[PDB]
């Protein structure tokens, strides 16, 4: 019965939009001053909210209270636009409407005045999928459109559009959202939905989102389903945070110290716990990389892993860079060799044994 | 009801046109001497003014006063042509009328004599999109053009046209506008618009235009919107930074200078934009290869790298060849190792750090 | 007669081996009424992606109601099992890749279900669709109508567009372990009344490499060639299971750099007839065991007691770096064995390279 969070929590006002401050400010200034162009192009990654901003702009233009940067959201025009029923909001699916016949029909039916609103807003989605003939047909119409016609375009790959089309439009490029904004949005949504949550679960979800907020919402839905109505740290770790445990750091420290017995005991403990071997190698490689970055720049380590910060810094002060590079290369090559190894555990054990054998400080004793 | 600068500000006389001196002078001399060719073709890059010059020529041909190089702009014919309402002016959009049955209906109407004007001008834009049979019909018409009919053709890519049409037409190629001309035009437009501006903002806008004055006007509109009615240098810098796509060359420069902080900042900026990491490595490898080629011979670069030619040449002059070879080898190894790295961003960071500091040990025999 | 992999297909969540997390998540979602409109099951070969998708469809379109435990007896369940249920449309995504098919399918998303309550599009092998098909799918996947559900099953999730992945709820299946495969094989054989031995089942489970369909195929091979009996000898013959000390003798000869004996042993093995990949795997295992013994004297397991002494001798003579070098050489030889003029030629080339590696 419950509708998906991504669809439900769609920004219905410019105040609900997370980030993208530059584009929102530019649009608000344009609407307030009255300098309204007839061709807007929106570009960026996935889930940034190009379509949401286009819908908000369409609401702002066609509002019974006039052209305002802050649409009322209560007038019948705003309600119809929110419900996807407004007659003067022509939404085109360029992915399916690729053949030039559809473009010709649209351009032939572009002269008539709008029914109720003061503009006839054409919102073409996934415009990058149109053939060259459609672009060429749309060129002149974009050049000198009728006063009561506005074009809004959105795409993920603006590099494949014709250069003329790019020249004929106002470009707005949205950037991926940072971790803090995603975490704050998830916290607000969960508070509104009355669902228990923990800070580390939100941190893990935000880190796994990787900019796209829709990915964050999908992962939140998965976590809610797994936790049976609650978003717990264990629930999130079960599916996403199977990695990022102190075992990887302990193994790295043992390898640095050439403690073969400790490494073997840690491997046995991980095997008992049922730890994926490829994930373990990935975590070790990541830890080595972050130590190298710390050696390069002291500000490389953020608060994300602050819990281990101190320890990491210690490994940066003692281990020479060349040893870190040797360990990283050895683990990477072992990863290359893992698929063809007789067994995953055997492959990881052989990789660690090779790393210990060529230890720069104390190699294993040689036969005599 | 503010109007778009590109749409509002359009040339109305040959004096208003910025640059393109040779084409304007040739057309004026031809009109003055009465040498009017039966078919004209206009070629060039985007926003160079092909359509504007074609419309000005159409005004000049059918002006009431006479066949003058500079149309009066006050007589009824000039006003109707400017408004696109002239009886004998036909603006065929070949892009939306590539069908043969649509072009045939006009090539047949070519027969009738002009109602009002001396000539029945046929302005065909985006002519390169016509079909083969449409090209055949146009070839027939150009082979037998009535003395009272003229044809004006505009196309960004004349190569697509058959050689016969090119032979039966007089070609005019419009050069990309220079930075100074674009800057002066922007300054004049802003002064006439009563909008505050700064010289550095104008210079940055002209540089970002890349020879297309229409792009310059679009960027000016964006800057005005962002600056709240003022073209401030801060707004232009912010816009350019948001839409900057030269991050590969900046990364190469930072790697050459061995500045870790700048490399990290550029990597973060690229991550925010979402640029593919493997594509970034490929672009860096290509840039290094082209810099090496420039070092071998200055003729390596052409018009393709005109946007960043100066920086590439400077890097070629400064960097010794051996360092370039070492960086190329390091980046190639990094690209080879990228698939096995846990994160592509992590692999790129490792490769860049290795190039900055860690020198590969050349294998011994 | 239907093959075992086609006759013992799970019909309820109780019959699914492993994949506990996915089943628990689906049950919680169905119980709490938080059904999503897009599910993408990603996993290795033969881990029940299609079976799980079909069971989810049965649960969604059961007459009793939306439940995580479909009855399996109502008309909807029977028709879904038979495969002639109208409202369940199963696409191939490999025989129908062109944009026209996807576009016409997306034009039939408005009509209400004929009989059931949800219109279930089960797209299998979705990774074999062109870019245009994915782009056409995108917007419909984002905000489909209420009465429509999309189910996706792929074995290669990294070939899909990022947007498609972001628009779907991802469930990552895990490869089955040896014990689970062995238990399932034992249960199936007990139900089918077929003789078996623990060693045969253990060998089949180990050779399955985490795929249950492969295990069932190997079991069928054994049954066909084993005169209706899964015996240890038949399984060993089919899989070419090394039993004698050929691997140890070859390793010792390679370490001693005695090329003559190595070639003689290779010729003798070829005359007998042995699977080369199995021999290479055994040699790699022996090298790993020697390295482990060098790490700690107690690593040597009791299983290889008969040769323990000999093994220890190697641990006292071969430097660890040489052991690593030999292990990597054998691994590379195994990797390139398929891409050689002959398997025996590849083995000989690998062993000659190992012989030439003598650093002492």
């Amino acid at each position: 019965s419950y509708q998906v969070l991504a669809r439900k929590w769609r920004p219905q006002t410019f105040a609900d939009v997370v980030g993208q401050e530059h584009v929102l400010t530019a649009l608000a200034n344009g609407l307030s001053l009255g300098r309204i162009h007839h061709a807007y192009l929106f570009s960026g990654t996935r889930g940034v909210g190009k379509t949401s901003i286009a819908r908000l702009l369409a609401k702002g233009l066609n509002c019974e209270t006039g052209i305002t940067a802050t649409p009322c959201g209560v007038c019948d025009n705003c309600r119809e636009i929110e419900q996807g029923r407004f007659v003067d909001l022509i939404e085109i699916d360029a992915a399916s409407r690729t053949k030039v016949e559809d473009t010709r029909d649209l351009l032939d039916n572009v002269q008539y005045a709008p029914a109720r609103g003061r503009f006839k807003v054409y919102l073409i989605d996934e415009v990058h999928m149109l053939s060259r003939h459609s672009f060429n047909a749309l060129l002149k119409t974009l050049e000198e459109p009728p006063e009561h016609v506005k074009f809004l375009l959105a795409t993920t790959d603006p590099q494949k559009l014709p250069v003329t089309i790019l020249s004929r439009c106002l470009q707005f490029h949205l950037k991926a959202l940072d971790v803090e904004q995603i975490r704050h949005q998830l916290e607000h949504i969960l508070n509104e939905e009355h669902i228990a949550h923990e800070p580390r679960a939100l941190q893990l979800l935000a880190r796994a989102a990787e900019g796209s907020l829709r990915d964050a919402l999908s992962l939140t839905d998965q976590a809610i389903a797994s936790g049976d109505g609650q978003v717990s740290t264990q629930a999130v770790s079960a599916m996403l945070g199977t990695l990022d445990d102190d075992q990887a750091l302990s193994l790295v420290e043992a390898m640095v110290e050439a403690n073969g017995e400790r490494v073997m005991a840690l491997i046995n403990e991980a095997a008992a716990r049922g730890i994926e071997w490829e994930a373990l190698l990935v975590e070790m490689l990541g830890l080595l990389h972050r130590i190298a970055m710390v050696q390069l720049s002291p500000a490389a380590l953020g608060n994300d892993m602050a819990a281990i910060e101190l320890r990491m810094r210690e490994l940066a002060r003692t281990i020479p860079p060349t040893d870190i590079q040797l360990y990283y290369q050895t683990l990477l090559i072992g990863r290359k060799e893992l698929p063809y190894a007789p067994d995953r555990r055997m492959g990881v054990e052989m990789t660690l044994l090779r790393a210990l054998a060529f230890h720069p400080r104390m190699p294993l004793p040689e036969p005599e | 009801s503010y109007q778009v600068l590109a749409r509002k500000w359009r040339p109305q006389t040959f004096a208003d046109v910025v640059g393109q001196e040779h084409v304007l002078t040739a057309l004026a001399n031809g009109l003055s001497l009465g040498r009017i060719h039966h078919a004209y073709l206009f070629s060039g890059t985007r926003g160079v003014g092909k359509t504007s010059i074609a419309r000005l020529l159409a005004k000049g041909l059918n002006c009431e006063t006479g066949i003058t190089a500079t149309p009066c702009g006050v007589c009824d014919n000039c006003r109707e042509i400017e408004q696109g309402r002239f009886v004998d002016l036909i603006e065929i959009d070949a892009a939306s009328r590539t069908k043969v049955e649509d072009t045939r209906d006009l090539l047949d109407n070519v027969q009738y004599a002009p109602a009002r004007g001396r000539f029945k001008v046929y302005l065909i834009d985006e002519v390169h999109m016509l079909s083969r049979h449409s090209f055949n019909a146009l070839l027939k018409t150009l082979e037998e053009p009535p003395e009272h009919v003229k044809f004006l053709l505009a196309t960004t890519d004349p190569q697509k046209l058959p050689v016969t049409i090119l032979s039966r037409c007089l070609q005019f190629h419009l050069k990309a506008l220079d930075v100074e001309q674009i800057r002066h035009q922007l300054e004049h437009i802003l002064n006439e618009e009563h909008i505050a501006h700064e010289p550095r903002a104008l210079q940055l806008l002209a540089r970002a235009a890349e020879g297309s004055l229409r792009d310059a006007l679009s960027l000016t509109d964006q800057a005005i919107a962002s600056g709240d009615g003022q073209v401030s240098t801060q707004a232009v810098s912010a816009m350019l930074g948001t839409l900057d796509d030269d991050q590969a060359l900046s990364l190469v420069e930072a790697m050459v200078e061995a500045n870790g902080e700048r490399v990290m900042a550029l990597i973060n900026e690229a991550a925010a934009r979402g640029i593919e990491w493997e594509a970034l490595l490929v672009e860096m490898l290509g840039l290094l290869h082209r810099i090496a080629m420039v070092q071998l011979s200055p003729a390596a670069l052409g018009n393709d790298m005109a946007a960043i030619e100066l920086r590439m040449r400077e890097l070629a002059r400064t960097i010794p060849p051996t360092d370039i070879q070492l960086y190329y080898q390091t980046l190639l190894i990094g690209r080879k190792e990228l698939p096995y790295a846990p994160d592509r961003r992590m692999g790129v960071e490792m490769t860049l750090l290795r190039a900055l500091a860690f020198h590969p040990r050349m294998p011994l025999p | 007669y239907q093959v075992l992999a086609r006759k013992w297909r799970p019909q309820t969540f109780a019959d699914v081996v492993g994949q506990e997390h996915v089943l628990t998540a689906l049950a919680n979602g169905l119980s709490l009424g938080r059904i999503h409109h897009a599910y993408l099951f990603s996993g290795t070969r033969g881990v029940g992606k299609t079976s799980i998708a079909r069971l989810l469809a049965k649960g969604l379109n059961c007459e009793t109601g939306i439940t995580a435990t479909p009855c399996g007896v109502c008309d909807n369940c029977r028709e879904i099992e038979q495969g002639r249920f109208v409202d369940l449309i199963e696409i191939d995504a490999a025989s129908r890749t062109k944009v026209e098919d996807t576009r016409d399918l997306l034009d039939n998303v408005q009509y209400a279900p004929a009989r059931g309550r949800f219109k279930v599009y089960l797209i299998d092998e979705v990774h074999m669709l062109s870019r245009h098909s994915f782009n056409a799918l995108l917007k419909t996947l984002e905000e489909p109508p209420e009465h429509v559900k999309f189910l996706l099953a792929t074995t290669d999730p990294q070939k899909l567009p990022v947007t498609i992945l972001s628009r779907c709820l991802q469930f990552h299946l895990k490869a089955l372990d040896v014990e689970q495969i062995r238990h399932q094989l034992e249960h199936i054989l007990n139900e089918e009344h077929i003789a078996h031995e623990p060693r045969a089942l253990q060998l089949l489970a180990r050779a399955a490499e985490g795929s249950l369909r492969d295990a069932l195929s190997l079991t069928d091979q054994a049954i066909a060639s084993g005169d209706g009996q899964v015996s240890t000898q038949a399984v060993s013959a089919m899989l070419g299971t090394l039993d004698d000390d050929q691997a140890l003798s070859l390793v010792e000869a390679m370490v001693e750099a005695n090329g003559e004996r190595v070639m003689a042993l290779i010729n003798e093995a070829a005359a007998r007839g042995i699977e080369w990949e199995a021999l290479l795997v055994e040699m790699l295992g022996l090298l790993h065991r020697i390295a482990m013994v060098q790490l700690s004297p107690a690593a040597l397991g009791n299983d290889m007691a008969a040769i323990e002494l000999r093994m220890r001798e190697l641990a006292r003579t071969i430097p660890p770096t040489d052991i690593q070098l030999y292990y990597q050489t054998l691994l590379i030889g195994r990797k390139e064995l398929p891409y050689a003029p002959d398997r025996r030629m590849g083995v000989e080339m690998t062993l000659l390279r190992a012989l030439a590696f003598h650093p002492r």
């Binding site: 050696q295 390069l296 720049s297 002291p298 860079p321 060349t322 590079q325 040797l326 290369q329 050895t330 090559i333 090779r354 060529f358 | 061995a258 870790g260 190894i333 290795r354 900055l356 500091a357 860690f358 020198h359 590969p360 040990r361 294998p363 011994l364 | 770096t321 040489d322 690593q324 070098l325 990597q328 590696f357 650093p359």
Partner: peptide, 25 residues
């Protein structure tokens, strides 16, 4: 020249030596 370097090369493990100590901070 050392046998360890030869074995490392045979294993494919590339060994990297820093050339710009000042770059690190």
């Amino acid at each position: 020249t050392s046998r360890r370097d030869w074995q490392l090369q045979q294993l494919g493990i590339t060994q990297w030596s820093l050339r710009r100590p000042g770059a690190l901070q």
